[PDB]
C-alpha cells in the first residue's frame, strides 16, 4: 500500500480505499459488485467507486474479473466508461483479494432520462450520435457490447453520454440472438441502438416481449417474416421449420409506424432495424447519416487501439487468473488530469 487506506462499512459491505477518496455514499449494488459515489481530493472530481464482488471465488469469477479490468483499461473514449484508477488494499499478491475500480461520477442512466416520455428531436440526435460514436470505437477494437439497453447508458445533465458494462434486456436484443445463432456479429449492437432510438422518439418500448418467443414474434410483426435471401442463411432445420411455419407477414411502413418523427430519423431506423444482420447499417456508416448533420465530424470519431482477446480461449488455474489481474492492477497508469 503506497497511499494510506481507511476502512468503513456501508450497507453490510466493507470498503477499504485510499484516503484521497472521501465521503463515500452508496449509489447501487449488483451481483457483480457495489458502487459508491465519492470525492477525489486529488483531482477535485466526483467519482464512482466500484468494489467487485468475490472476484476470485472461482476460475469463472477470476477470468471475468480479468476480462473486466482488461477491457476497462483499454477503453479510452469520451462516450465509453473508462478508468480513473484501480486499486487494492493488498500489499502483495499473496494477500490480494479485492479489486476497486474508479471512474468519473455520472448522474443517471438513460432510462431515468426517458421518464417513459418523448425526448425532443435534438436530444434524440445528440444521444444516439454519442452512442454510435462510442460504438464505432468499441467495434473498431473487435469488441461486441451485446447487452446495450437504456440502463447501460450513463447520462449527465448536459446530455453527455457514456456506454457502460460491455428494464428487460431481451427487449433490446437482436432477433438472431433470440434464435440462438452462434455466429452473430457486431450489428447486434446496431439492432439495440435502433430499439433505443425508437423508444426515445415514441416514449414506448418498441418490442416489449414477455419471453424469447414473444420477443421474436413482436419483431417479425414490425419488420416482417424473413425473405428468401435470409432463409438461405439458417442452418438449423428446426429453426427453419419454425420460421417458415409462421403465417408470413410483410414489413410495415416505418413512415406510418413513426409518423410525426423527423423523416431522417425514420430513415435511419429503417437502416438499423433490418432483419438480416448482414444488411444492417454499421456504426461508422450511421454516423455519416444526414440525421446527424449537426453533430457529425469525421475527424473527431476515433477508432481504438487493437485489443487482444486471445486470453478468452485460455483455460488457466484460479491463481493464474488472479496473478494476471494483479499484474494489471500494478501496471495501471492513470489518464492525464
Ligand atoms: C450498471 N450501472 C449503471 C453501473 C455499473 N458500474 C458503474 C461503475 C461504478 C464505479 C466505478 C466504475 C468503474 C468502471 C466501470 C463502471 C463503474 C456505474 C457508474 C459509473 C459512473 N457513475 C455512476 C455509476 N454504473
Ligand atoms: F424465438 C425462438 C427461438 C428459437 C426457436 C427455435 N429454434 N429452433 C427451433 C425453434 C422452435 C421453437 C419453438 N417451437 C418450435 C421450434 C424458435 C423461436
Ligand atoms: F426470423 C429470423 C430473424 C432473424 C434472423 C437473422 N438475422 N440475421 C441473421 C439471422 C440468422 C439467424 C439464424 N441463423 C443464421 C442467421 C433470421 C431469422
Swiss-Prot record:
One of its GO terms (cellular component) is spindle pole. Residues 21-292 form the Protein kinase domain. Activated by cell stresses such as DNA damage, heat shock, osmotic shock, anisomycin and sodium arsenite, as well as pro-inflammatory stimuli such as bacterial lipopolysaccharide (LPS) and interleukin-1. Its main location: cytoplasm. Brain, heart, placenta, pancreas and skeletal muscle. Expressed to a lesser extent in lung, liver and kidney. Changing residue 311 to S: Emulation of the active state. Increase in activity. Keywords: Acetylation, Apoptosis, ATP-binding, Cytoplasm, Kinase, Nucleotide-binding, Nucleus, Phosphoprotein, Serine/threonine-protein kinase, Stress response, Transcription, Transcription regulation, Transferase, Ubl conjugation. Its cofactor is Mg(2+). Its EC number is 2.7.11.24. GO terms for molecular function: ATP binding; enzyme binding; MAP kinase activity; MAP kinase kinase activity; mitogen-activated protein kinase p38 binding; NFAT protein binding; protein phosphatase binding; protein serine kinase activity. It is found in: Cytoplasm; Nucleus. It catalyses: L-seryl-[protein] + ATP = O-phospho-L-seryl-[protein] + ADP + H(+); L-threonyl-[protein] + ATP = O-phospho-L-threonyl-[protein] + ADP + H(+). The modification Phosphotyrosine is found at residue 307. Dual phosphorylation can also be mediated by TAB1-mediated autophosphorylation. TCR engagement in T-cells also leads to Tyr-307 phosphorylation by ZAP70. Dephosphorylated and inactivated by DUPS1, DUSP10 and DUSP16. PPM1D also mediates dephosphorylation and inactivation of MAPK14. The active site is at 165 (proton acceptor). Changing residue 321 to R: Loss of kinase activity. Component of a signaling complex containing at least AKAP13, PKN1, MAPK14, ZAK and MAP2K3. Within this complex, AKAP13 interacts directly with PKN1, which in turn recruits MAPK14, MAP2K3 and ZAK. Binds to a kinase interaction motif within the protein tyrosine phosphatase, PTPRR. This interaction retains MAPK14 in the cytoplasm and prevents nuclear accumulation. Interacts with SPAG9 and GADD45A. Interacts with CDC25B, CDC25C, DUSP1, DUSP10, DUSP16, NP60, SUPT20H and TAB1. Interacts with casein kinase II subunits CSNK2A1 and CSNK2B. Interacts with PPM1D. The TXY motif contains the threonine and tyrosine residues whose phosphorylation activates the MAP kinases. Serine/threonine kinase which acts as an essential component of the MAP kinase signal transduction pathway. MAPK14 is one of the four p38 MAPKs which play an important role in the cascades of cellular responses evoked by extracellular stimuli such as pro-inflammatory cytokines or physical stress leading to direct activation of transcription factors. Accordingly, p38 MAPKs phosphorylate a broad range of proteins and it has been estimated that they may have approximately 200 to 300 substrates each. This is Mitogen-activated protein kinase 14. It comes from Homo sapiens.
